[PDB]
Symmetry: C2
Subunit: 120 residues, 2 copies
């Protein structure tokens, strides 16, 4: 009934898509959602529309889209919302898209940054 | 003696720089480092070279540069390392040493954050 779709930038290099895959893999083993799908905005498949369609196919009526970006930007305020038909200018059913918020300057980002400083 | 320099993409929108600022503020409040500086790769000040120079001025000899990016990419493999003179293409004293660190990557804590975000927390 619920689907989590992780969505990321995507690059020509593969590292952007490896991350999303890894993250999706880690959320799967937490057994929080029935369906979990990734979608990359550019250069790589699956594409955001592809992910959403796949989630619908597996029977989800709540599609939670989470933007895996540190900071808001044009990609999150325009590009992705369009792709999701949340903004004027992929057509869903009676299903509902719930577009969530980016990572932002979470306390946990500070935690991670500190470890990185020390090579952990 | 040691400086943490947080380095980010930078955009024409301000959100990227605000992120860096907030993070730097939080690191300051943890009292782990003497000098803490942010540098944005494009479109904004301070610039990476500016941040490194500023850190040297305040007297640091260990410059820890952390790339605040989720994933490696050309910006972290090439652009930033050039700006740091770590890779053949501003100018660093013999006294100081750059320690270029690693990105966030698919940390367990990123999964934690993602879940909270999914729930509107």
């Amino acid at each position: 009934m619920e689907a989590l779709v992780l969505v990321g930038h995507g690059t020509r290099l593969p590292y952007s898509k490896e991350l999303l895959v890894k993250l999706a893999e880690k959320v799967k083993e937490r057994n929080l959602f029935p369906i979990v799908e990734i979608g990359l905005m550019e250069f790589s498949e699956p594409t955001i529309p592809q992910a959403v369609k796949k989630a619908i196919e597996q029977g989800a009526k709540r599609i939670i889209v989470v933007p895996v970006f540190l900071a808001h930007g044009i990609h999150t305020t325009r590009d992705i919302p369009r792709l999701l038909g949340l903004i004027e200018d992929e057509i869903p059913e009676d299903v509902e898209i719930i577009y969530r918020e980016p990572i932002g300057a979470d306390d946990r980002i500070v935690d991670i940054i500190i470890d990185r400083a020390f090579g952990r």
